[PDB]
Design a protein around this ligand. Sequence first.
Ligand code: NA
Length: 397
Amino acid sequence: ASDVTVNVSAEKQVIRGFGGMNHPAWAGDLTAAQRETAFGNGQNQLGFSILRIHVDENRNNWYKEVETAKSAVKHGAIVFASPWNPPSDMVETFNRNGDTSAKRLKYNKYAAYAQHLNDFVTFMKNNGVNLYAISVQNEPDYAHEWTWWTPQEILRFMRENAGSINARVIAPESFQYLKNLSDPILNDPQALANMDILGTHLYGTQVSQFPYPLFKQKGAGKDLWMTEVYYPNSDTNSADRWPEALDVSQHIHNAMVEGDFQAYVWWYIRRSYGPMKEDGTISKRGYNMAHFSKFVRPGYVRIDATKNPNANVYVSAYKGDNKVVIVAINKSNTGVNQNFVLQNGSASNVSRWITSSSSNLQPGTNLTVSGNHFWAHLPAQSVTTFVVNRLEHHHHH
Ligand code: NA
C-alpha cells in the first residue's frame, strides 16, 4: 500500500462549517429535543455548525423560524437564509421558451425586493439572531416551482441592489453549479464587490465539475459555499442503508478536496433520507456527516494530504485548535493498513472514531505517533476520523 502524507504547513481553505436546512412550513419545525441533537456536539449529537433557513415571501410568517434559529446560535452555529419567492405583489409571469406560466421579479421591484431581504435580516436581529448571510434567490436556474432569474437579471441585482443589504450576500445558488449563472458576477467588478459568498448546490453535478478556475482567478477574499444537497438520493427510508451511506462522507470529501468548499449544507435536517431520522435519532448518513461536523470546527483550515492513496481509499485533513483531524474512508470490502506520514507538525497521540455497518462513531484504540508517522487499520466499508493532538502550542502563555 501507498503512504498518505499530511503537510500541516500546506494550507488550503478555511472551513466555516457543516449543517443543514430547517423548514417549518414544508417539513415541520425541529422540536426542542431535535434542536439539541442537531446543534449540540456531545455524544449522540450531530455538532452541526451551520443552519440554513428560508425567507418566507409573507413577512407575517417570519416568526416561525425564530425558535430553531435561536437554538443554533446558542450552540454557536451560524445561521443563513435563502428566499424562494419575492412577496407576490413583486412577481410577474413571462414567456420562458414557450412556458407562459414562468415567474420572475418585476424589473421595477428590484429595490423593493432588496428592502424585503434587509427587513428579514432586521427581524431576525430583533429576535436575537444575527444572521451570518442572506441569499438573493434559491436555484434561479431551476425555478419551475418558484422564481426564475437569468444570469443577466442576477447580474443587474448584484450590481445595483445587493450593496444595500446589511448582511453578507450569497449568490447565485445554481441547482447544479452551472458556471454560466455565476461567471457574470465574477467577471463584473461592481457585482463582485457586492458578493460575499459564492453559493451553489450540487444536484447532479459530476466531480469533474467541482473545480472552478474562474473563481480561483477572480474570487480572492470571497467565500465559496455548498449551500444545499442531498446525496446519493432521496429514497424514502434510505438513511440507514449500508454501505450506501458511505457515499455521503465521500461526497463531502470531494466537496472539500475537489471543490475547495468552505461550507457543506444538507437539505432538510430531519427526513427519512436525511442526517436525522423522523424518530429524532441520527441516521447512518448523519454519522457520515458527523465524521466531519463534530471534529472539523469553524475556523479550522483544510491542509494538503494524499487524497486517494489506494483504490477505494479517500483521505482529507484539517488543522485547528492545536489538533490535526484526518478523515479516512474505505469504500472496499477489504480492511487495509494505512500509513499516515505527518510533515511540519510534531505529535504523539492519536484518538479515532469509526462508523461501519454495525457501529456508529464508536471509539477505536489509541494510536502512537513515532518518527512522525503512524499506522492505522481502516476496516472494510468504513469511515474513520482521527484526532491528532499536537505538541507545539503557540498563541499566548
Ligand atoms: Na456588501
